[PDB]
Design a protein around this ligand. Structure first.
Ligand SMILES: Cc1cc2nc3c(=O)[nH]c(=O)nc-3n(C[C@H](O)[C@H](O)[C@H](O)COP(=O)(O)OP(=O)(O)OC[C@H]3O[C@@H](n4cnc5c(N)ncnc54)[C@H](O)[C@@H]3O)c2cc1C
Ligand code: HEM
Length: 584
């Protein structure tokens, strides 16, 4: 059966998904299709099967109820970053998210159009109050820990009771099972001097920018990295700051050397409490991060696919989607008004005679179809290789959206008694390849029940970002170089890092990686987060101009994807699709 969610191993941007895109991007090979007969006609052709491209098709059909719509997508599954991973453990299914993790502060951030999409799909945000088992890990006495590595700190050491508040936090602050900073930092494998300095950072904040007005402070915190701020203004040693190096890897796709100090201040990082800075923004920082389908935001993609192509799965609503069986052979049936064609790379888009000719490549062979309208919902940096009408200024704009690589790894564990024995549900590793390691969010929804028994299997989620810290690289270059590091890495080398890290962190409490790991799925997102304007390297006014230029409509071709908003969130993918549809 054709069913990508059950596949393990090397996933995300799997082999087969990207070779045609690279012939265009790397070798500059062109696949012209204007010499081939038009095979199919549509009202709308959408390039890209992620949340944006599915939303584009969904709102377009809301406006044109009878529309015929083709969605071309080059992965072997729909959803883009929002993928569903599966494990089989002990006779039951254990679900995980391939990428797009949760709905980010949705009561604060979700536009009225996005809320409308969710309601029409039957997603009720308030349901997650009971679905997300918020007190599960805390009520077991579990806390978050930090893992220091031998190479950077002299010794391997796991220190728990971390009180560090996070930006997107699913744990109520009262339930951290955490210790005081003095007690927590006291266990850090650092010289006594370093420890006192870190403790003082918390116990005795000072105006490390005294003499500058508030405006000069805000300017300086914009053009100074967080790591430099701690080195030059707080005075921490080069060994102390390493503790902070990877904290921002997941939420920003880069480390503390590329994190603007002002952005660290907004994310709740330590060091600013006595600066006199001003403090809406806090309605978002404080919303609980509980809006998590058991396969992450893949549920959004799956709800949209079922709503657009009802033959694919039965059901309606957020409860039954979780375990709905999707028939991939029904996604692309002829005559059917909405068709989703996977394993196809769009290669050519061209306005003509009031419609859009679109070429794509599938199993090595070229095809040509027509639509009345086209929405580019692919990676914006791909659009110039496809869209033949672009001015050279607009193609250059689109090229500047250099996305960030990230690797979301799912690991099936035979049991989690080593986690229980160490009192932990989540680890931060300041310098290791994997900077976030955790037992998965405990969510019960539909017929799916989150794993509860420490003797029985559970899924672990861990994040690996191929940063090059402290090299003097701007953000775009760290993103490119990170992708080149991922390209040189086999699956065998990706697995060694997974097993080496789990062994060093969990080994002491009896972990054996060969014996205890019963599954690995690596979601390799070489092209992950959209670029976002970074005040350490970019100018706000030039970047905004470039952004709007890049998403400008071209005839009957509109530009969607979260890339168009320079904003890597599912609600931007939705809002940019909505803008694309209203334009046509
Ligand atoms: C690891 C990770 C975790 C995330 N977690 C969250 C989260 O918790 N909350 C949140 O709000 N956001 C999150 N995001 C942001 C995420 O990108 C969005 O939530 C959403 O998935 C973006 O969807 P999109 O449609 O804009 O782009 P995508 O889904 O990335 O792109 C659509 C598809 O177009 C395809 N494509 C490219 N070129 C072509 C071509 N020539 N022909 C055909 N198809 C093509 C791409 O391969 C891609 O699959 C996360 C992102 C990543 C990478
Ligand atoms: C699957 C693993 C992948 C790896 C390791 C990878 C790696 C890279 C690297 C190293 C580059 C050069 C640096 C850069 O320009 O960003 C690059 C460029 C590019 N990749 Fe990927 N890539 C992958 C998947 C994909 C996919 C799935 C697509 C299309 C959907 C894609 C489209 C491109 C394009 C268009 C460029 C050129 C960008 C430009 O010239 O502006 N790649 N890739």
């Amino acid at each position: 059966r054709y069913y990508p969610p059950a596949l393990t191993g090397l996933r995300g941007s799997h082999p087969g998904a990207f070779e045609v895109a690279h012939q265009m991007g790397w070798e500059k090979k062109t696949f012209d299709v204007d010499h081939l007969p038009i095979e199919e006609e549509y009202d709308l052709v959408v390039v890209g099967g992620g949340i944006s491209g599915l939303a584009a098709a969904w709102f377009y059909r809301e406006r044109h109820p009878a529309a015929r719509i083709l969605v071309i997508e080059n992965h072997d599954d729909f959803g883009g970053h929002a993928k569903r991973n599966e494990f089989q453990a002990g006779g039951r299914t254990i679900l995980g998210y391939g990428g797009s993790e949760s709905l980010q502060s949705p009561n604060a951030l979700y536009s009225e159009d996005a809320k409308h999409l969710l309601k029409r799909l039957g997603v009720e945000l308030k349901r997650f109050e009971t679905a997300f088992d918020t007190d599960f890990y805390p009520g077991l006495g579990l806390s978050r820990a930090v893992f220091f590595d031998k190479a950077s700190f002299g010794v391997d050491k796991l220190v728990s009771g971390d009180p560090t508040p996070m930006v997107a936090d699913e744990v109520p602050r009262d339930r951290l099972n955490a210790r005081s900073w003095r007690a927590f930092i006291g266990d850090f494998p650092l010289s006594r001097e370093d420890r006192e300095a870190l403790i003082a950072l918390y116990e005795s904040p000072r105006d490390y920018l005294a003499g500058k007005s508030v405006e000069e402070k805000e300017t300086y915190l914009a053009k100074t990295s967080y790591r430099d701020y701690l080195l030059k203004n707080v005075g921490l040693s080069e060994t102390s700051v390493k503790y902070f190096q990877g904290r921002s890897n997941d939420f920003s796709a880069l480390g503390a050397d590329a994190l603007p100090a002002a952005d660290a201040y907004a994310a709740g990082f330590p060091g600013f409490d006595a600066l006199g800075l001003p403090q809406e923004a806090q309605a978002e920082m404080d919303e609980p991060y509980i809006y998590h389908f058991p396969d992450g935001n893949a549920s959004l993609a799956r709800l949209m696919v079922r709503d657009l192509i009802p033959a694919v799965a039965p059901g309606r609503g957020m409860e039954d989607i979780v375990m709905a069986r999707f028939d991939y052979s029904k996604l692309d049936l002829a005559g059917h008004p909405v068709r989703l064609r996977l394993n196809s790379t769009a290669v050519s888009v061209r306005n003509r005679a009031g419609g859009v000719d679109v070429g794509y490549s599938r199993a090595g062979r070229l095809h040509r179809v027509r639509g009345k309208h086209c929405v580019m919902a692919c990676y914006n940096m791909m659009v110039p290789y496809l869209l033949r009408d672009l001015s050279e200024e607009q193609a250059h704009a689109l090229s500047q959206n250099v996305k960030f690589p990230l690797v979301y790894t799912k690991v099936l564990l035979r049991n989690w008694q080593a986690w229980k024995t160490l009192g932990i549900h989540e680890i931060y590793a300041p310098t290791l390849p994997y900077s976030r390691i955790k037992l998965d969010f405990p969510v019960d929804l539909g017929s799916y029940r989150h794993p509860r028994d420490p003797r029985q299997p559970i899924g672990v989620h861990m994040v690996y970002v191929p940063t090059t810290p402290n090299a003097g690289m701007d953000a775009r270059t760290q993103a490119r170089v990170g992708r080149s590091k991922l390209y040189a890495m086999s699956f065998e080398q990706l697995e060694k890092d997974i097993r080496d890290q789990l062994q060093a962190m969990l080994g002491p409490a009896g972990f054996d990686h060969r014996r205890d790991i019963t599954g690995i799925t690596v979601n390799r997102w070489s092209h992950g987060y959209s670029y976002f304007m970074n005040t350490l390297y970019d100018d706000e006014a030039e970047s905004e101009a470039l952004m709007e230029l890049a998403r400008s409509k071209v005839g009957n071709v509109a530009i969607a994807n979260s890339d168009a908003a320079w904003d890597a969130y599912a609600h931007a993918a939705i809002d940019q699709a909505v803008r694309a549809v209203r334009e046509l």
